[PDB]
């Protein structure tokens, strides 16, 4: 935005009196392929988006009239046409980002969420005091529970709360980089976060690394990623402001030696929501979209039990399509829409995976 | 006791100033099957439980006052919340016990004990002369008889007396690994006993797969495990006095090689408890709990016929519970409780299993 304005300094469109889609931040949200000069080329592409419509329909030549230089302008669309036109360059990797997710954006469950306060935030603020108290909290925790449900969003919540930029390392992200043997760079991302410290290193669905590779020639029967993760733990400590956060669907199958205490310590379980949490997370979705309270939010809570947050966040999201409001197919929000969605949405039909958690978690 | 104590020198839990037993043996009971790391996490999560009380309520940031340290006192409640916390998680890996029992700790039949001494104590203390007399009393021996009495207890009494290392293989450990096609983990504990020998290795249903079938062995009487037991029993040398103990609930499932020379020389049969033995067993169990001279210990025994050690122990714990919980009176448990408690119960050992034993001992 501060680089683009330099090219707005090179345009007499005006800004801060003009506030509009052309506001440079809203357009800056689209692009990570680029850096400062690429934006210069971009505004030249946008500036060229203009000349290609303007100049040809004029059919100019050595004479250049002044009126054109006057009546001609640079619209918001040509930027979009310039933004949709892409030449991604900047290094292949995942970059730090600050989301807006917070306690306000997580309905969740206060009991398990409240533990995140003392698990992350407190160690962040007072690493020197626990020395005075004579305490050294863990190096990270491990989340396991029903798939989806927002377990990925739970870390994005503590991300904005920690006031530190956030990186999410997801299984597919390592695999695409793995083919290039860049796992050493995946480790560099952690050393990179340290140079950026404070920053949060989030290992997502780390059970997703092994399943595709079975047992093959990785480091040997144990993965090189595991070898990269073992070494990733060698560098960090409880001292650094960087926080390791595990999230896993199956925190067993791979190589529990790496999941062993001292590597990933706390075992935290994400339970599926309940009627009230189902209602709370529901209220968070419906408040943004227009609402006609023909539904009884407690009644559709009666119908709904055994539905995880994934089904709900999808159900809240899925029934929205069946309902139509502000266009002329419109049908308002009604139990009929949530009734038809009841058939479309898949319940939780496996209590197996649920009892493996409860039995294993209890004792 | 030692691990927790290292943690207890940096924290004032060592001597008891509080309402519990702070000698760490009490906290050691609920902790069965832990290692130094798991306990460090336990007391570490205990400082968290302590931290959760004191810091959030005062909620300091920079300051470090003296009062917050004066106010902080570690309480039992932290461990209770920690023991109720995720601290128990997984059952980790197999373990071997350590013995106690001596003649003082356990009663039971005198016939088999002396018979076991002939088999155990004599070859251990006097192997030399037995070599030159053409007299070999035993190499190892088999214990079979009524289950549930903890015949292991008898093997521990003689083992502790003779001052020979005792080893017990719990049935569940043999049940799981046999399916995993791993008989080596079973060798390790035995091999651990062979090198440290002279030692007495007790095997509780090392054939456990077979005893689960009850009377018969649907497959052959031999399986993968016994094949090495056969090999091991023969492979033992005279460099160290060694006596191996197989034990099972069902003797009829044995490979005939086992019963032969150099493997099982002697076959031990524990006949049903003697009338006088039941009296002593009933007295040992009842005086470990609240007791008063309100009863006649011989009268309760007369009503008992066929009851085994497992049944006699149930009578004592059941009486006190139905008896006065707290009283100033000299009587705690009463004769009416013992008598009435007998009418409900029934003898454990059954006739069918008895017949299958007698025929073998004769043959």
From Swiss-Prot, chains A, B:
Homohexamer. Forms a ring-shaped particle. Signal peptide: none annotated. The lineage of its organism: Archaea, Methanobacteriati, Thermoplasmatota, Thermoplasmata, Thermoplasmatales. Belongs to the AAA ATPase family. CDC48 subfamily. The chain holds residues 364 to 726 of 745 of the full protein. It comes from the Archaea. ATP binds at residues 145-152. This is VCP-like ATPase.
């Amino acid at each position: 935005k501060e680089i683009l304005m330099i090219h707005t300094r090179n345009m007499p469109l005006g800004m801060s009196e003009e506030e509009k889609n052309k506001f440079l931040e809203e357009m800056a949200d689209y692009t990570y392929g680029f850096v400062g000069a690429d934006l210069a080329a971009l505004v030249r592409e946008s500036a060229m988006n203009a000349l290609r419509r303007y100049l040809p329909e004029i059919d100019l030549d050595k004479p250049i009239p002044t009126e054109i230089l006057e009546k001609m302008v640079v619209t918001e669309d040509d930027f979009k046409n310039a933004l949709k036109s892409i030449e991604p360059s900047s290094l292949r990797e995942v970059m730090v980002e600050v989301p807006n997710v917070h306690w306000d954006d997580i309905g969740g469950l206060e009991d398990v969420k409240r533990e995140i306060k003392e698990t992350v935030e407190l160690p962040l603020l007072k690493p020197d005091v626990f020395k005075r108290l004579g305490i050294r909290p863990s190096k990270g925790f491990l989340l396991y529970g029903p798939p989806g449900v927002g377990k990925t969003l739970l870390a994005k919540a503590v991300a904005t709360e920690s006031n530190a930029n956030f990186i999410s390392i997801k299984g597919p992200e390592v695999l695409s980089k793995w083919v290039g043997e860049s796992e050493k760079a995946i480790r560099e991302i952690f050393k990179k976060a340290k140079q950026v410290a404070p920053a949060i290193v989030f290992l997502d669905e780390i059970d997703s690394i092994a399943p595709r590779r079975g047992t093959t020639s990785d480091s040997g029967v144990t993965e090189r990623i595991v070898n990269q993760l073992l070494t990733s733990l060698d560098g960090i400590e409880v001292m650094n402001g960087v926080v390791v956060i595990g999230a896993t669907n199956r925190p067993d199958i791979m190589d529990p030696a790496l999941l062993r205490a001292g590597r990933f310590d706390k075992l935290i379980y994400i339970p599926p929501p309940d009627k009230e949490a189902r209602l709370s997370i529901l209220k968070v979705h419906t408040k943004n979209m227009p609402l006609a309270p023909d539904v009884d939010l407690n009644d559709i809570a009666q119908r709904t039990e055994g539905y995880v947050g994934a089904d709900l966040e999808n159900l809240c999201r899925e029934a929205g399509m069946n309902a139509y409001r502000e266009n002329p197919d419109a049908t308002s929000v009604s139990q009929k829409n949530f009734l038809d969605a009841l058939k479309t949405i898949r319940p939780s039909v496996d209590e197996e995976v649920i009892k493996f958690y409860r039995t294993l978690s209890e004792t």
